[PDB]
């Protein structure tokens, strides 16, 4: 009785699962809209990140050694370096920052939420004064090297200041996930230990019906033996006179 | 106690039923002995 | 089994009765002080 009750107390723990599955519906609904927001935002960056690898050494190295950067490249290369903790407005500091062979690595390492709002707000103001610039001259023929990186520099601004709208969503998701995941681990545990109890009960409970029947067999044999004892005793007292 | 009485009294009189079942198995076993014993003699006289 | 679990469900709410036994202690303790206040006050009126 207790093993099933413990199993049914785990069924009470299983009665928690559909509440947790209801939480899963909350998680799935919140995840789907977060993914939809990610799908509208993340996808262009993946294209830009791949375009960084597609960049050829000749396209960048030749233009680094140029004695004067074109005005289109100046407006866009300055803002990119501000991401690299090297905020400056001089061409030579641009040249030095790109010379190192270690500069082919962080074309993808840079990540959106590391940007400070004041630094981001500077770029929209820089965007306003340079709206005809950026991708429009990339399409023209400004330089093959700038293409992959300028559009990469254009992005990371459509993530900031509105990933902050996702921050409470992800934090709520993390609270929902962590509460569910540990509880979902219990759900797998509860199902396993319910079966473990039931399997134990199955080998035990079903043998008791035979076991109690075995007791019923003994009492039937006991009654037969007792009846014979009384019958034979009656025979002896009847045959006593003989 | 109403459940306990129901738990109790409707547990052992139902175990009387399985005692009757045991008698059926014994009767079936006794018949099964007659099944093979009669068949064994039946095939013995097949040549006859 | 279900009869026992229902009985043990009533055993769970029998534990609630144990909580009411704790409430009974609260009732008795509050009653005793109220009776003591009444004993110091009501008795002269009963004589009157």
Swiss-Prot record, chain B:
Modified residues (N6-acetyllysine): 43
Location relative to the cell: Cytoplasm, Cytoskeleton
Domain of life of the organism encoding this protein: Eukaryota
Function: Cytoplasmic dynein 1 acts as a motor for the intracellular retrograde motility of vesicles and organelles along microtubules. Dynein has ATPase activity; the force-producing power stroke is thought to occur on release of ADP. Plays a role in mitotic spindle assembly and metaphase plate congression.
Assembly and oligomerization: Homodimer. The cytoplasmic dynein 1 complex consists of two catalytic heavy chains (HCs) and a number of non-catalytic subunits presented by intermediate chains (ICs), light intermediate chains (LICs) and light chains (LCs); the composition seems to vary in respect to the IC, LIC and LC composition. The heavy chain homodimer serves as a scaffold for the probable homodimeric assembly of the respective non-catalytic subunits. The ICs and LICs bind directly to the HC dimer and dynein LCs assemble on the IC dimer. Interacts with DYNC1LI1; DYNC1LI1 and DYNC1LI2 bind mutually exclusive to DYNC1H1.
UniProt comment concerning the protein's domains: Dynein heavy chains probably consist of an N-terminal stem (which binds cargo and interacts with other dynein components), and the head or motor domain. The motor contains six tandemly-linked AAA domains in the head, which form a ring. A stalk-like structure (formed by two of the coiled coil domains) protrudes between AAA 4 and AAA 5 and terminates in a microtubule-binding site. A seventh domain may also contribute to this ring; it is not clear whether the N-terminus or the C-terminus forms this extra domain.
Medical condition linked: Charcot-Marie-Tooth disease, axonal, type 2O: An axonal form of Charcot-Marie-Tooth disease, a disorder of the peripheral nervous system, characterized by progressive weakness and atrophy, initially of the peroneal muscles and later of the distal muscles of the arms. Charcot-Marie-Tooth disease is classified in two main groups on the basis of electrophysiologic properties and histopathology: primary peripheral demyelinating neuropathies (designated CMT1 when they are dominantly inherited) and primary peripheral axonal neuropathies (CMT2). Cortical dysplasia, complex, with other brain malformations 13: An autosomal dominant disorder characterized by global developmental delay with impaired intellectual development. Some patients show signs of peripheral neuropathy, such as abnormal gait and hyporeflexia. CDCBM13 is associated with variable neuronal migration defects resulting in cortical malformations.
Family, per entry: Belongs to the dynein heavy chain family.
Protein's name in the database: Cytoplasmic dynein 1 heavy chain 1
Organism of this sequence: Homo sapiens
Range of the intact protein held here: 3438 to 3485 of 4646
């Amino acid at each position: 009785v207790k093993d099933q009750q413990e199993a049914e107390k785990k069924k009470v723990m299983s009665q928690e699962i559909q509440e947790q599955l209801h939480k899963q519906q909350e998680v799935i609904a919140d995840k789907q809209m977060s993914v939809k927001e990610d799908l509208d935002k993340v996808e262009p960056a993946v294209i830009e990140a791949q375009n960084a690898v597609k960049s050829i050494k000749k396209q960048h190295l030749v233009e680094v050694r140029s004695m004067a950067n074109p005005p289109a490249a100046v407006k866009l290369a300055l803002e990119s370096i501000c991401l690299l903790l090297g905020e400056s407005t001089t061409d030579w500091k641009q040249i030095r920052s790109i010379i190192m062979r270690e500069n082919f690595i962080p074309t993808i390492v840079n990540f959106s939420a590391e940007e400070i709002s004041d630094a981001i707000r500077e770029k929209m103001k820089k965007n306003y004064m340079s709206n005809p610039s950026y991708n429009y001259e990339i399409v023209n023929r400004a330089s093959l090297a700038c293409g992959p990186m300028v559009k990469w520099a254009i992005a990371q601004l459509n993530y900031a200041d509105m990933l902050k709208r996702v921050e409470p969503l992800r934090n709520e998701l993390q609270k929902l996930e962590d509460d569910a995941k540990d509880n979902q681990q219990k759900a797998n545990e509860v199902e396993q230990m319910i079966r473990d109890l039931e399997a134990s009960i199955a080998r035990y409970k079903e043998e008791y019906a035979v076991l109690i029947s075995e007791a019923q067999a003994i009492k039937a044999d006991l009654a037969a033996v007792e009846a014979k004892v009384n019958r034979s005793t009656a025979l002896l007292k009847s045959l006593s006179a003989e």
